Write a protein that binds this DNA or RNA. Structure first.
Ligand SMILES: Nc1ncnc2c1ncn2[C@@H]1O[C@H](COP(=O)(O)OP(=O)(O)O)[C@@H](O)[C@H]1O
Ligand SMILES: [Mg+2]
Lengths: 308, 516
DNA sequence: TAATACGTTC
RNA sequence: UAGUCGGGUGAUUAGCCAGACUCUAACUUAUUGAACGUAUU
């Protein structure tokens, strides 16, 4: 059935879809991307044919996603995520380890079985094909280990779905004690105006993760961080200032000003100019008031010339 | 790349170093300045612009600890608790982490030490593995250097990998920059309870046995005598000319010729020696160590080598009296050895500092009061931070006398009822610095000022209760106990004075009651 | 058995 | 006291000026993939 649906969407024969899917878990290109500091990140991206199938799958099958899930959601972004916590004085950030690669076919099917919201039902015969569509085989010789890949188009949707029940439970728990909760992919953020309420959250998380996923999904204890108005609060790279407003942060603002000054004196190359324009667009999205100030500081003409 | 250039120009050390490695003089200079820049404060002490210290430690299913989080002070942290609370376990965890820095400063891709699969995993851990997670700080350019040591129990199917690359990356910066141009290097040392148990010198000998085997008296004495003999009694060309002139003259000048030949050889060696191993003169080294010992060690004001008797003897001025070092207590010897060893390593690793003891580093000391008389317990920590102002000290103690000299912010205490589940260590509620010993015993160490197991400790309480039972008058029973108190503690005892006070007050209270 | 308009986040 | 927040000034990622905050307590991250902003059309 899944095959027939995909074939219809992609205007291909059932046979050619089925044939393609036999080796689909191995049709991933692996490459490295430089980290901002030292080292490289490893990415596994599906082949074109497989990407098309994955997109078709996601189109055909609507999977439930909790409202607290901010990543990969239409109309929700890093701004919305940060804004959810801006009004609260105390902040807790928690992180899940190897988030995508921890999600296995077993977890996926468990989530389908557990799910109370209107989950698609799949025929047993289709289960094998679905696994081949959604999960990558990292070790060529070990056919038994399929995992979600970081760079697949379907992985965001599947990951959000797998966290649906988790999000439901923790959201309910947080609501009772006036904690704001949002999830951006593997990043969990908690904020409150009540002192000491956030101290219990890590323990609650460990129990819940164990209950739902056993040992498959775990907290990164090194990346669990407490913050307050006494210290720097950031959520998904956005600074929350002491006036409870979103900010780019002082250093980023100063850097943009530096680049504007360089542009003013024709010292910025085309690449740096393009970079500056991107930074200003981002600044406009996160902190529009900053753009207003820059316009006042710099000659509207200069800024318009720059945005051309 | 342009991104790395931006971050590097923003002051990020790792990005600057990556640009240096790919390419070049500008980036090198930026890295070198990050490490070497500092200032002299109002007190005349050199302060690095970019400090290096351990910020936080987390222990998961390690030995007794299910999950433990510790925030450390930049200068001094003292960990206190009963036997078996895991104080030594904490220091061992840190020392293993520090071994990864040392290994990689010495050699590219050097391997540090590892957690034991037999002993280090908590015995009743469901998930049969242990983690030691540490975060280090190195100035505002490198606010976080995370390292994790992990080990899975023996015969477990899935092995858990340690994450050590950030340690290696930072250690690589130190190693590579030092190779091109000499820099000052961080000191790492552990002094455990085993300190008490009874080639030419080269800069990176300072890292040899630094995290176990350090601080041994015999090594010091031998070294000190050696330095003395060399420092008893100019250009190479000038020295070469002097040696040549003296050789031509050569019988009474033969001793002088041999001395000058030695000086020439040493000068050539120093000339031939590499930038990565640049070192201060033996005379200077000797002087710094002597000053360190005399500054730090209680009641030693002077130290020197005598050879007048015909054997090489180290002598000290102890409490104003000149004595042989063998006439010191074992407590004082062990402490002298610790300070001498530390000073020796600091001198070797900080050749560019005016005062090499103002170098950076992390030093761990287990049971600092080991073998010390109460008198010297009252002095030991006062000295250490003044002599080594930029070292992060992490120490353990049992001593209330030691705690009386330390601020409460530096203290981390275990709860006495902690069965290993506890999440965070915290400071005591009472201020310890300048406080009475008896108060620290009761308020911080949870011990009565009088031994509860001794009957005589309860006599005053019992005496008071007898007085109150007989409307304040001294009856046959109260008199007997009074006599027992007098007989046991003595006529001039504080206990008898208290009893006398009770009698006087109660007599007067009763008289008032009768005047109804 | 990856893609290239520029930024941001995971 | 120290750290943090950032309005102004500065051929400007620096330095300097002003105001504010303080649960034991941020460490600014990752693309070509996904989402969001901007540009092209
Ligand atoms: N693997 C282990 N599992 C459980 N408890 C352990 C383990 N290893 C050591 N312990 C416990 O740790 C304590 C000793 O830790 P230690 O650091 O020596 O304490 P101290 O503070 O006295 O120096 C004892 O209570 C011992 O029973
Ligand atoms: Mg992109």
């Amino acid at each position: 059935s899944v095959i027939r649906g995909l074939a219809a969407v992609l205007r291909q024969s059932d046979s050619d879809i089925s044939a393609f899917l036999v080796t689909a878990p191995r049709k991933y290109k692996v490459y490295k991307i430089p980290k901002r500091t030292t080292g490289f990140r490893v990415i596994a991206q599906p082949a074109k044919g497989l990407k098309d199938i994955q997109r078709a799958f996601v189109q055909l099958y609507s999977l439930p996603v909790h409202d607290a899930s901010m990543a990969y959601m239409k109309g929700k972004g890093i701004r919305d995520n940060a804004a959810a916590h801006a009004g609260n004085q105390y902040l807790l950030k928690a992180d899940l380890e190897d988030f995508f690669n921890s999600i296995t076919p077993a977890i996926f099917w468990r989530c389908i079985e557990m799910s109370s919201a209107q989950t698609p039902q799949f025929e047993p015969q289709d289960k094998l094909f679905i696994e081949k569509i959604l999960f990558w085989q990292p070790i060529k010789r070990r056919k038994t280990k399929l995992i979600l890949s970081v760079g697949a188009p379907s992985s965001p949707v599947i990951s959000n779905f797998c966290m649906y029940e988790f999000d439901n439970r923790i959201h309910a728990a947080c609501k009772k004690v006036e904690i704001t909760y949002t999830r951006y992919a593997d990043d969990l953020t908690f904020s409150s105006n009540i002192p000491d309420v956030l101290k219990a959250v890590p323990s609650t998380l460990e129990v819940l993760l164990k209950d739902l996923f056993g040992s498959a999904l775990r907290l990164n204890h090194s990346k669990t961080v407490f913050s307050s108005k006494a210290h720097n609060r950031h959520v998904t790279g956005i600074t929350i200032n002491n006036e409870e407003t979103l900010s780019l942060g002082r250093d980023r603002k100063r850097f943009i000003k530096h680049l504007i000054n360089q542009y003013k004196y024709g010292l910025l190359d085309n690449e740096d100019k393009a970079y500056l324009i991107g930074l200003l667009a981002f600044a406009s999205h996160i902190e529009p008031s900053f753009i207003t100030r820059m316009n006042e500081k710099y000659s509207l003409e200069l800024m318009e010339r720059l945005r051309g | 790349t342009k991104q790395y250039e931006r971050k590097a120009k923003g002051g990020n050390l790792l990005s600057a170093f990556e640009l240096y490695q790919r390419n070049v003089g500008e980036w090198f200079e930026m890295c070198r300045d990050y490490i070497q820049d500092g200032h002299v404060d109002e007190s005349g002490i050199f302060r690095p612009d970019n400090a290096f210290y351990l910020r936080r430690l987390t222990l998961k299913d390690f030995r007794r600890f299910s999950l433990l989080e510790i925030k450390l002070e930049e200068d001094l942290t003292v960990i206190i608790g009963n036997n078996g609370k895991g104080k030594t376990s904490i220091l061992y965890a840190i020392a293993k982490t520090l071994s990864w820095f040392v290994a990689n400063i010495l050699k590219e891709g050097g391997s540090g030490q590892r957690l034991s699969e037999m002993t280090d995993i908590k015995n009743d851990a469901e998930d049969r593995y242990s983690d030691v997670s540490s975060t280090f700080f190195f100035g505002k350019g490198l606010k976080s250097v995370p390292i994790r040591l992990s080990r899975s129990a023996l015969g477990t199917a899935e092995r858990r990998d340690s994450e050590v690359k950030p340690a290696k990356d930072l250690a690589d910066i130190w190693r590579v920059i030092n190779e091109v141009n000499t820099i000052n290097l961080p000191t790492f040392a552990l002094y455990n309870v085993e300190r008490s148990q009874p080639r030419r010198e080269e800069r990176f000998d300072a890292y040899s046995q630094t995290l176990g085997g350090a601080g041994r008296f015999d090594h010091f004495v031998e070294w000190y005598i050696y330095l003395h003999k060399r420092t008893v009694s100019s250009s190479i060309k000038e020295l070469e000319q002097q040696v040549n002139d003296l050789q031509r003259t050569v019988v009474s000048v033969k001793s002088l010729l041999e001395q000058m030949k030695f000086k020439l050889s040493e000068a050539i060696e120093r000339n031939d020696a590499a930038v990565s191993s640049r070192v201060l003169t033996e005379s200077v080294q000797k002087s710094i160590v002597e000053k360190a010992i005399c500054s730090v060690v209680p009641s030693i004001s002077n130290i020197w080598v005598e050879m007048i008797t015909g054997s090489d003897l180290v002598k000290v001025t102890n409490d104003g009296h000149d004595v042989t070092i063998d006439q010191l207590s074992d407590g004082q010897r062990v402490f002298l050895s610790l300070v001498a060893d530390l000073a020796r390593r600091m001198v070797m690793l900080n050749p560019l500092l005016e005062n090499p003891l103002e170098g950076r580093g992390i030093v761990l000391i287990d049971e600092i009061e080991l073998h010390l008389h109460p008198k010297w317990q009252q002095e030991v920590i006062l000295n250490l931070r003044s002599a080594f102002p930029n070292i992060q000290f992490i120490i353990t103690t049992h001593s209330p006398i030691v705690l009386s000299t330390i601020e409460k912010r530096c203290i981390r205490e275990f709860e006495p009822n902690d069965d290993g589940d506890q999440s965070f260590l915290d400071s005591p509620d009472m201020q310890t610095k300048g406080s009475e010993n008896a108060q620290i015993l009761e308020q911080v160490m949870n011990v009565h000022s009088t031994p509860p197991g001794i009957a005589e400790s309860h006599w005053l309480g019992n005496f008071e209760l007898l007085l109150l039972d007989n409307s304040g008058e001294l009856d046959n029973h109260s008199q007997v106990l009074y006599d027992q108190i007098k007989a046991h503690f003595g006529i001039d005892s504080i206990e008898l004075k208290k009893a006398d006070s009770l009698i006087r007050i109660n007599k007067m209270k009763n008289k008032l009651n009768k005047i109804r």
